[PDB]
Amino acid sequence: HHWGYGKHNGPEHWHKDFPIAKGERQSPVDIDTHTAKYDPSLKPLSVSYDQATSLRILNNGHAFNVEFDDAVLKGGPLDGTYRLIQFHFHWGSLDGQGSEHTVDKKKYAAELHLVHWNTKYGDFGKAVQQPDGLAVLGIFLKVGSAKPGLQKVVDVLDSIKTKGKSADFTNFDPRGLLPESLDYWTYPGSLTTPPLLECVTWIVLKEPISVSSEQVLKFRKLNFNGEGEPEELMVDNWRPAQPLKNRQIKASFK
Numbered sequence: 001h002h003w004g005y006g007k008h009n010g011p012e013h014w015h016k017d018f019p020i021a022k023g024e025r026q027s028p029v030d031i032d033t034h035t036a037k038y039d040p041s042l043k044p045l046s047v048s049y050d051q052a053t054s055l056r057i058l059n060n061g062h063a064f065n066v067e068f069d070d071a072v073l074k075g076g077p078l079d080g081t082y083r084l085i086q087f088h089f090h091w092g093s094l095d096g097q098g099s100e101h102t103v104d105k106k107k108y109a110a111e112l113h114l115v116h117w118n119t120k121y122g123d124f125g126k127a128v129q130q131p132d133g134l135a136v137l138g139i140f141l142k143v144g145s146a147k148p149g150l151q152k153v154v155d156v157l158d159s160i161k162t163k164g165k166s167a168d169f170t171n172f173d174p175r176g177l178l179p180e181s182l183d184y185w186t187y188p189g190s191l192t193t194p195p196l197l198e199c200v201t202w203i204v205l206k207e208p209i210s211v212s213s214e215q216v217l218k219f220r221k222l223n224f225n226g227e228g229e230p231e232e233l234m235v236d237n238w239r240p241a242q243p244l245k246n247r248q249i250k251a252s253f254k
């Protein structure tokens with residue numbers, strides 16, 4: 001019985017193996033624009049991805065991720081430097097849902113997560129045990145014009161349809177996944193999948209990227225299951241918004 005997104009192993013069940021699921025700084029959250037506070041101490045985000053070295057893409061039975069040779073994220077709300085280790089997405093069974101964070105309860109079609117670990121901890125495994133161990137950059141996807149920087153990703157999905165499948169994915173530039181503006185919201189939170197560790201500074205961009213219906217449809221062709229098994233379509237791999245508790249969401253923009 002391995003965690004998943006289904007009726008019998010989904011987000012409502014996770015707390016039984018991972019009690020921190022009911023913790024004080026869980027993610028994602030709804031971003032309420034009536035209450036999110038502008039904060040002048042917040043610097044512009046520094047995204048330095050020109051030296052990013054992608055390695056492979058893998059269907060892990062939950063999502064797909066692109067792994068990097070650990071590119072740096074710094075500035076913004078962060079002290080010191082964070083290394084890019086991987087990215088992945090969460091998405092829906094229809095365009096009207098799929099994101100993890102929401103904005104005034106609005107769900108986007110998907111959400112991109114660029115995962116970075118704090119270099120002061122030496123490696124990812126040590127970083128996740130610290131409250132400031134990770135910085136995840138979250139970017140909403142809406143349906144509109146195609147995002148050319150995403151094309152390499154969606155085109156490769158046919159070759160990694162089922163759990164365990166991987167493909168070479170060298171020379172992918174994550175800079176092609178960013179919107180124009182780096183205006184952001186930020187709050188202290190957690191990983192949104194088991195083990196749900198409370199080790200993340202969340203940085204969620206205000207501006208969504210536009211992807212085409214054709215592109216996002218390709219996400220929905222992936223399988224949760226392995227080859228030669230009952231077909232379980234990979235859709236709705238998102239955790240709902242969690243209690244904000246005693247936290248404050250700050251905005252970098254007025």
Ligand SMILES: COc1cccc(CN2CCc3cc(OS(N)(=O)=O)c(OC)cc3C2)c1
Nearest residue numbers: 065067085086113115124136190191192193
């Ligand atoms: C330990 O080195 C790794 C290198 C590449 C991929 C991984 C797997 N892991 C990294 C961090 C992470 C973190 C995640 O939490 S999230 N949604 O970004 O808050 C996650 O949920 C979908 C998945 C993963 C995948 C580990």
Ligand SMILES: [Zn+2]
Nearest residue numbers: 002060061062
């Ligand atoms: Zn798994």
Ligand SMILES: [Zn+2]
Nearest residue numbers: 088090113192
């Ligand atoms: Zn994620």
